[PDB]
Amino acid sequence: SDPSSINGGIVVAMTGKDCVAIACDLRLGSQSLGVSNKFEKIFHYGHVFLGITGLATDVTTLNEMFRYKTNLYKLKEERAIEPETFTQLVSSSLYERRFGPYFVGPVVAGINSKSGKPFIAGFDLIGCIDEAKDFIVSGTASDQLFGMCESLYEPNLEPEDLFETISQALLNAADRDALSGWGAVVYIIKKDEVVKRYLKMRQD
Amino acid sequence: TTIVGVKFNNGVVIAADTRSTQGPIVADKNCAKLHRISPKIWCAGAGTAADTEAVTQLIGSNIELHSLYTSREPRVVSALQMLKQHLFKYQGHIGAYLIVAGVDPTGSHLFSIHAHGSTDVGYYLSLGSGSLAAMAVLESHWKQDLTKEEAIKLASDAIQAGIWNDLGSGSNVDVCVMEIGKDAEYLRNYLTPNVREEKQKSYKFPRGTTAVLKESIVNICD
């Protein structure tokens, strides 16, 4: 009965030379029982990408909530929301439920369309912002991801090279966690193109 | 965390480390614990990270509206009063431990606030997990009639004591100087005595190392 580790899952994000990458596993389970191998944890609103780990009902609820809010934003502002602004919106929304929180570990990723600067950010369940130059990690194998990222990462990686680094970070971390794995997805994000790749990983 | 505040001749200085923990894991190696309530009233925060950020922003917002309403520059005691009454109402459940400091038309000020809503006055103060390491330095080296350069040195030394000796604190030293009659200067990463050494090996993989099942272009446009 620990909400954050019933369903299981992980998300990781990285920066590169004029690009960003965000990746997640596909498992959804009920403790030991693996239930679904198609449960994606990364969503996007315009060019801003959001990954969410934790209790699956809240992952779904929050996705629907931020779609709701970003749609109203676009109608009133007459432009797409930017990563820096969206980050603030997530923080606001989570802290609104301070004493009855969504059991989640969200991760923002995207490129600012005006400045062109790569941007990533993470949060705790009550909305504390964690900004970073290098990488952000989240989920039941966060310890593993911290270890992989801290050793494998280097700055200013090209999109093709950055893909290999983030993919190897996710895969090897997931294989040391019982509640993570069962497939994986990686998003490579350039200024005006986005490639999505499904990884081959061990299915146990 | 480790955070400190030190009064001097013509104002006040505050400082903080830049470590953010998550159990035994370092989540952020360079997070900003110095917060701006108003242009010349700044706040150092320890405890629950979301709470120190949220409470400082809320009071900062209300202080701005108050300043516009009264056509006056805001006072430190106003920020102090608003913070303590907010925290007291929540009976400690909002885990914010703050060092509030600044200059206003009354003069220069230095206070501390605890989660349950108690406030303390002093010439030198320290809060957080590394407060004992910091306070030891302050108690040993503090004197009356400090200069600007002496107060910065004392404050950053107190933070260093926390960085090295407390496992809850680390990385860099942030500083903010608030002098009377001058603009407040925020010195982000004033010291960086924890630079990561060159790695022994590059872990850049040969292109094609990762096995792939599917590719597809994602549509971000309308």
Place this chain on the structure above:
Amino acid sequence: GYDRALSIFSPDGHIFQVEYALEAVKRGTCAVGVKGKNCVVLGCERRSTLKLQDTRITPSKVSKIDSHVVLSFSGLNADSRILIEKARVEAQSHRLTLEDPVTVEYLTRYVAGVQQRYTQSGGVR
């Protein structure tokens, strides 16, 4: 506890107490064992200086240790009961742990081991 070493070596390399125990066997009523092609037969002597006996209730010379093994003896009658009792207990203990009745070799080896233990234990003959 009574500790005395009763069974001990003599200058000529003999343990007299063990050898005197053999004399007690030599005094006892005769017993014979003959094994055929598909059977074994145990014969036993009963001395006829005892008339007015009640043969219904008098302890029999041949004893069942289990349903498939028997034991006859020569020597002190009171001593034989102690060996038979220990053997019958070990027989049930073997069935309980190994889930199989004792072999005749095993049961013999156990009884022989008990007899040996009394030749180099203090306080016993």
Place this chain on the structure above:
Amino acid sequence: TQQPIVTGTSVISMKYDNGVIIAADNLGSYGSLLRFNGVERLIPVGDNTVVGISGDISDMQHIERLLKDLVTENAYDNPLADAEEALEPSYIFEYLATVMYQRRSKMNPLWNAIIVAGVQSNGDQFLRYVNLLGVTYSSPTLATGFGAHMANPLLRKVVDRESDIPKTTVQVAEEAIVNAMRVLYYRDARSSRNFSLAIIDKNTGLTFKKNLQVENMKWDFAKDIKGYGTQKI
């Protein structure tokens, strides 16, 4: 299973070029009550070792008796009891460390934290820690209780690593210890002003200083402090 009744607070210590220094206040607290004021918590063993003890005082007195008895036992059938076969600091520590771990393993601990400071026969400085759990460690500076949180930071500014030991004189080292004792008086609610200090040098030997007091305190700034925020008087 125990609970400590009469207790002693911080013990602090460090190494310097020719030897080691150790100190501890003379208080025996009974909870919040500062019950006993004449309590000596530094106990010398021979002329080359000093054992500083914090925690339960009844258990401290038991350990005193054990050390006293150890000296007696070593002298038995030993012509070199005051020479080559005299008790070393390393011998005294290992004995205590053995006892502490045996007692924790029987779920009946000696509720203490102990620091054995001294000088070996070959001149080497000895300084090592042990507590109720049987945990042991060594470091250029060592301290117990509040001392661990407040004294160590100050003492490590003088001797931060091994190479700083030859560079540190006895004058500089004692000054740092006395300063640390003042800071503990400011900030530890179960500490007293009166304390004892011991120096073990490889040249000048054992110097035991009793009835010291914390002095040169800063309290004058208190008069300027008024209210807790908005009071002006």
Place this chain on the structure above:
Amino acid sequence: TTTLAFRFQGGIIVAVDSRATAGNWVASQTVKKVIEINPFLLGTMAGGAADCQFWETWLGSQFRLHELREKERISVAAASKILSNLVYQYKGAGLSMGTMICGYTRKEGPTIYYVDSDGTRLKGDIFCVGSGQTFAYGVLDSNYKWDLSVEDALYLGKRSILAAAHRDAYSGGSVNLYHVTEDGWIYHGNHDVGELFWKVKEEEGSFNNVIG
């Protein structure tokens, strides 16, 4: 863990995974969960790793002493009962063991005994033991017949572990196969799930729930 063993026309099949966990931390993917007690006896291990590994190793020493004393290999029944009587003495003390004693003798023939740490001892034809026992049962039962060939029986055992390795979060790594005949046990290799899953998916056409 997931472990199984079943009796059939051509002897006994025994199959196990190789994962070891400490909570959700995957501690090892290369654990040997089958003990080779002697050329005719095998023992499977599920539950506490130390408990199983220590006592089944101790078990092999007792059986060695039996054949020295009795000039005869120990029976599967007697072997399993030594273990069950041992753990019964420790009942309530907190041992965690789910074991299967599998082997062949002349008097008994191929025999399997289930023995667990609360003292249960059961003779039987089919058993699955461990956190993923139910997953293995599902595949094994629905495909089991007595008249399976040695080739088909080996595969069914391998496939049943794979099924559990997939679904059970606390099972995986690789499959270890064994075949027990009148002549003794025969090792049938270590099979990594990393390669085995995809090989089985492609060739068998199963696992349609997974993204191919």
Place this chain on the structure above:
Amino acid sequence: QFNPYGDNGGTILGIAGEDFAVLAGDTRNITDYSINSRYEPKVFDCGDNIVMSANGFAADGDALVKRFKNSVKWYHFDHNDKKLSINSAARNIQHLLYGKRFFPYYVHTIIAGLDEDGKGAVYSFDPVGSYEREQCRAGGAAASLIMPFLDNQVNFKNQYEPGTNGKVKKPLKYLSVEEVIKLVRDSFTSATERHIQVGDGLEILIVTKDGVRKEFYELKRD
């Protein structure tokens, strides 16, 4: 109520090569948020070319190492100075640990050396005695950070041959002593960055047919 266990932190790492084996471990010792020692070694030469470390509760760790060192001594006395093989040492350690099954040594134990064919060997133990020979193992506070990195770099897990459509795996090969030390140093600097209980110093013990060499490297002290 009295609690007989404690956590002294730290982390250890063992890697095996073709004709050598290394056993590394940081030199930091802690309780809660305090540093006890910046240099307190916990990797030990136990004789017969066997190095050992028992990380976790230091009192139980020291007791175990002390008993095994003693076990080696009595092995020589009772068996005509015979060299204790690494496989025999491991089995002996199992019995030491399981001997206290119902009041355990709270430690993760790792030993390293050469097997009887001269090839490098690393064994690892849980607190109650279950053991396993491996090419690779990390133990202690930062084991969860370091271990997956080792899977990737030592055993080449999840790495395929470029251009082979993820069909051919990267072939396994032994690493040179130079390459292994690079991986150890990078593992510990990474763990120091992200785990608070890891830092101060790194001590590596290398084991070849020639004997037991040592190497020491500084780590970040925050």
Place this chain on the structure above:
Amino acid sequence: TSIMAVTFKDGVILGADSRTTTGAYIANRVTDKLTRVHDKIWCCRSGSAADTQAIADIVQYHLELYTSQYGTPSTETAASVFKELCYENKDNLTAGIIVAGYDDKNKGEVYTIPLGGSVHKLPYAIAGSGSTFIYGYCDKNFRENMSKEETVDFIKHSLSQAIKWDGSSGGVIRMVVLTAAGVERLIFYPDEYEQL
């Protein structure tokens, strides 16, 4: 804490130590536990720092509003406001407060308010953890209609002992004198009071 208030010939004097603790750590060694709710009505605070501050702030607000409408409030009135807060919120408060003030008609007065929220008017009052150690001393040494110098010595000697024995008390001894002459602040440092 150690706190006390003593009436005398010319008015009343409040006294207190300066120690604030979190467990055994002294969070503030120079605390000011004597606080103003009105010109010549002050209080001594013991118990929770947060609670006593919150209460004192509300009382000051009430008495300021009282003064605007009805002029200077009596010391009894101030004590009644303290009581009303402490009694009605007894379940959520940890505050032991001593109210002291100077009227011209009523001269010096002291009201003590323990945990329950009860009110007790007394010639002198002691409170806080360190007060337990000086009940004997204060009872034997208190006299009515003392002089200013005598009352200062009585408070100094009393709090000196309370500090000496109580670990939860220490630092400087603050005092506040309330008479017709006005308001006077006094401070006394360890080097003086310890060797009394």
Place this chain on the structure above:
Amino acid sequence: MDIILGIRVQDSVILASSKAVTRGISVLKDSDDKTRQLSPHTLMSFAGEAGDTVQFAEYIQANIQLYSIREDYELSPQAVSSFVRQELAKSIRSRRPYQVNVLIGGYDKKKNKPELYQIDYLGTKVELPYGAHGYSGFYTFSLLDHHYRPDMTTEEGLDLLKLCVQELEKRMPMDFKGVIVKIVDKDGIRQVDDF
């Protein structure tokens, strides 16, 4: 309440639900239908806490039937499932949450495709080829991993379902008194009377 299963095949969705209702040491009923028709081409099975199950199922049924009348239109299985998930997602943070797990099997007439949704009491939705709630999954998932193919017929699906029930009857501790099977396809909902 205990066993509920669901299998999506080429042209239909098949739901199986146990008939037993037990309370204490007594089986009070052995012919219970643990399902409600939400719309002509959408069926929901349920299992969980006593009382909560039927109360929740009928409450959903009423709401979907209200929608059908208002718009003179049938909601898609995807739309219905999303409505159900939200109601459970609200529920979990209520004073007293609904402790009900559901399977929603429906046929989308616009896409001409069968759809199966599995939703737990927390509001955790997933679309699946085959699904189960409770301890049933621990046997049926691994079985279906092996035997299931995506292009199977309704008859092949029923045989696949028989294979599950047989396994459950063999290895489950409790007697669940068989199952009621229902099929959802292009022609609506119908019950298999002989299973």
Place this chain on the structure above:
Amino acid sequence: MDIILGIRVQDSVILASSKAVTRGISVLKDSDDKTRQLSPHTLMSFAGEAGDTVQFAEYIQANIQLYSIREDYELSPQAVSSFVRQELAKSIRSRRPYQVNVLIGGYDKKKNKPELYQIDYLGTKVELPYGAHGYSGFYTFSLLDHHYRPDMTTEEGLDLLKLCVQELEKRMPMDFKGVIVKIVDKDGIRQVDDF
């Protein structure tokens, strides 16, 4: 372990005992014989805590078999039951008691009468015409109150026993996988293979 029954009739004692052995959510075995022969004309069935049951049953079996060899004589069912009761009566005040309930069905050759004894884990002995342990009794006792007669035959007793098993299969929550039935009479102990 769960269901054990016993019925004494005119000339015999009939014991019925469930075949299922369950642990967790898995039926590990469906052909278990929960009985041991103590002597040629005495049979004991058992049910309770895992491990304890068989360990206790065999321990009694060994002791009775030892007595038989020593005296070359069979103990009466009354004598055996009293020995069993005393062993359980000791057990209950031990460090770790046997949690086993037993039924002892025997034929006394001296009296030419069948006898049925019911003993619980506390050491509570009663001689009965019909008996049961566990939740079984809550159905079977009232049933036998109605249908039982003292002068019934063995065949009439088996029909009476079928009537009990049917009721249990209908109203019990758990699947106990049928029963093994054994008869004790003047000619000894024999098993009914088709039930």
